[PDB]
Design a protein around this ligand. Sequence first.
Ligand SMILES: NC(=O)c1ccc[n+]([C@@H]2O[C@H](COP(=O)([O-])OP(=O)(O)OC[C@H]3O[C@@H](n4cnc5c(N)ncnc54)[C@H](O)[C@@H]3O)[C@@H](O)[C@H]2O)c1
Ligand SMILES: [Mg+2]
Lengths: 56, 273, 123, 157, 309
Amino acid sequence: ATFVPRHRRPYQFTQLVQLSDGSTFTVRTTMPTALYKSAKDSRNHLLWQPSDKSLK
Amino acid sequence: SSQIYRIKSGVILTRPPLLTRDLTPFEESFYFYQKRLNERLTAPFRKDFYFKKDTAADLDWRIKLKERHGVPAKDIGRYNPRGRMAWNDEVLVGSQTSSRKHMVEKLLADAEMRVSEDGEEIPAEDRVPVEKPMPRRTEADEKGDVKRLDRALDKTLYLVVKKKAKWMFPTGVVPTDEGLHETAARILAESAGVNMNTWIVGRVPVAHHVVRPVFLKKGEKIFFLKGRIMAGQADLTDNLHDLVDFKWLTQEELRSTLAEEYFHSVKGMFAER
Amino acid sequence: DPRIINILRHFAVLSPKRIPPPLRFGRNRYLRHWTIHRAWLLFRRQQREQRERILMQQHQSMSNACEELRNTEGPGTRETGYLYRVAMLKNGVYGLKSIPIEYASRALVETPGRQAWNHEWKR
Amino acid sequence: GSWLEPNLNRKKKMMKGRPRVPTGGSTKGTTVVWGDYGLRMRDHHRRISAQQLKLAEDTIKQRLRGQKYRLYKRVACNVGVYVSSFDHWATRVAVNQIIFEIRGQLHEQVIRDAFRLAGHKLPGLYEFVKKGDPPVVGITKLEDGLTVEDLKNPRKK
Amino acid sequence: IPDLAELETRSALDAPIPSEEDKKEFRPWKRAADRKARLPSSRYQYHPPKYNRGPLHPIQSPPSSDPIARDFVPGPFNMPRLKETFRTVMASDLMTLAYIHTPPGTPKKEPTERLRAWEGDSPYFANRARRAPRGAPELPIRERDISFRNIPEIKEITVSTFVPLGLKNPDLLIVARAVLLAMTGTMPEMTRSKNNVVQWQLQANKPAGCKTTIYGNAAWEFMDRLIHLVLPRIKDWKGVPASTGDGSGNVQFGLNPEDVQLFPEVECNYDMYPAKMIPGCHIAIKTTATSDRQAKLLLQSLGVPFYSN
RNA sequence: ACUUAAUCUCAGACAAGAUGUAGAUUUUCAUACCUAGGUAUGAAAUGCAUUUUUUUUUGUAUACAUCGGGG
RNA sequence: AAAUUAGAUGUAAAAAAAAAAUCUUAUGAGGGCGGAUCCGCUUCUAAUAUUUUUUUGUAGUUAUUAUUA
Ligand SMILES: NC(=O)c1ccc[n+]([C@@H]2O[C@H](COP(=O)([O-])OP(=O)(O)OC[C@H]3O[C@@H](n4cnc5c(N)ncnc54)[C@H](O)[C@@H]3O)[C@@H](O)[C@H]2O)c1
Ligand SMILES: [Mg+2]
């Protein structure tokens, strides 16, 4: 008699992630925060934007 | 003994969509339906795991939590997983709650701080609203500028050029020294300038157009490569080839401008959006 | 110790005995869920068949051009199929700098940023 | 290990056994496989010790010293001889089997003198063998079109 | 047409959309209140068995799709932006970048038997056991070309944390279990040590870590947080080593403890974990690719910078 | 064959591409031209070199087919 | 050097029909002939196996290309 395990998942919310460029997308996360304002990200890192001179 | 066909190498420079496609009505209703089902099967939210008791964050969460009638989520409306009225989890037709505009409204109505650092509720009139998201449709969308790359952010744009007149893509004769991928890169620089950041996908052609020879006239065998523009704008100033105008068109507007035979050959390369 | 108890209280809630029980739907609700389930799976089929149709058409276009390109000759005094053999080379395709980081890193976003596109980029 | 000292345990005692006596047409070890010339044991089957094979090698080296040659050994001492506890390592050799092989920029007569002197240090009678000559089935060389099936055929007269 | 006559005439899928008037009088909340009673229960009272005894047991378990089933997981809640981005635009490119044209009438390739057999004239060769794998002891998987029917994609991601010191301080494993809970959104499964080393004080068969595996959309969303929010914030980060890869299409790397707290889910409650109890994790990205170069190419298509190890 | 003790041999090939070079100064192609062909400036073809087993050279067929120490 | 984790083969999944032959089996035809079922001979059908045998068919669906209206 193989047991049927039941999934143990925590509460999840729908969060808006506003990157440093102002663009906003929706995500599914567990944190309670509503809007995550990201000041630093791939859009403001030189390694991901080598041609950008403002960050250089 | 002259060659019958003139080999040409062209580049179809395209700007990929910058925004996700609009969700269908079923997708919105389905997500809301599943989000509410998640309330009935996921563990309850422990505020003690994220907010310390008797702090600005805790007190601020508690006030807004009372406005949501105890629901820790902000995009599922008012629904209690437990109780005698948990069975009524299916919204009726027309429910604005399941719309995306309502989700963004509630989620942005929550990011504002309602309690100062001293634990006192900020007056409703002295509350700072958060900077709302940018609109999906830019000024070019309303203006209808076919020379802008901000237009139709939800669809792919194709760089089409006129030659002193028939609209077509940047093309040119292939020399004996360079190849197809080297020839296309040169034509793009001589046509639209070098001020655009472009990445040629590779060496394989995505489409081809054959103009059979008229027995006489020499046939044309055009092989079109595919290109991606990270940034920049096309400039026809001081172009070597006799180019007059350029415009960025969608897949729908493309068929109207280009000829039927010229379009029938390059439509196989198209994508979904 | 007090902080650890806060952690344990989180796991104690996820215990198999504490988590909610399996759903219990009636017939009318169950039938309604069946239609929602049935439609969603069919909707994926349409998206799948549509996504797979475009992928097929693009491959055919490449094969047509490539097969045709293999038969052509030139330019000038170049043996037939030279261009076909050169196009199939994969120099640097699997290298570190194959695909530019900037192009790949940029992704689709629900809403645009402050500056949707930068036309001032200079080589 | 080596060809004179195997990677075996001396404590584990072995039975005497008996050298291989092929009575079914086998020709294993009777031909020169690597070198150009060889040293064949042509009389009977014995059990050679590691002290007798080391002296044979030293004999060849002494005679051919200062010259370019490559000596191959076609036997290994993997049989522990226990003379009442372990005494020495030995090797079982069948009849008409090659013991050594050589190849290099040497004169054939100079190699004969080397193998000749090595046939005195080893026990038994030995024979100088070249590369390309037929094998030996028992004590009969398969020469003049003779095959291994003619030796098995009852009708021989 | 006779074929159409065989269809169900009383079709409910062809019924008109409900009107507005009837929509206004449909109030599930008013119906229950007015009744002031409990409606009789239905005689159909089948519930999924807690144990599956077997396929022929009188009581059977329903498929996991069924909502009543104890394995049911709520369906998708949103479209991961990275899954949408890759399929819509990136997929067409990878197919174009890596493509080898097959002639129209090319004969299909016959895969050779990797476990060779003995063929020859020796009577012994007939019943000889199949030869061993030539080269490595285990057979490596053969690479599949990138075609319109085979586009490498991300399938699942396994985050594994090893905490040797936990054995002595049991509070290191409790905090480690919580970090992977908020980071991934699943219930980690504790792991046990397998080797005994006295120098490192490691004892075998004792709980010394936990792990998680997220599949489907949850995996894509995890990559989004990693590539665009966590990895860019690491100080003096060079990239994923160019030597990563097991030879079958799976990429693996390790994060330091100070970069695990950079996760958006961990930093918000960074004060709820005791000091210096945040562990480091090993992230193994499993993809549909069939080779190391195809996998690295896929990650490069998602904006993953690689550095020469 | 599997296992045991020794010993021997090998650890690498082709096609294409690319890279230069002496050439011959012919044809095709691309430009500056003239008046559609030649006038030229180039490229290619051309012959052996050169690069090719994981390489900044891909593919095919193969066990991608090899590591430290000492002199 | 020695700690945990993730890996490490390939193929198939619309659908076949039909002719004879070689045995072997059958509580198949209660076969026939000698001595319903036992035993020895035995023809016929059926099934499995085998043939490289004799072939026929290899579609439909999605898309591409070519001609045709
Ligand atoms: N799963 C099937 O029934 C099925 C059938 C035939 C072929 N295939 C093949 O299997 C591979 C993958 O199957 P697929 O095409 O069904 O992938 P899929 O993307 O449709 O489904 C994969 C996961 O993403 C989720 N998902 C799908 N669409 C979504 C959306 N619009 N919004 C949010 N979430 C969404 C699904 O619930 C699922 O968990 C493909 O190569 C396909 O050709 C699958
Ligand atoms: Mg003697």
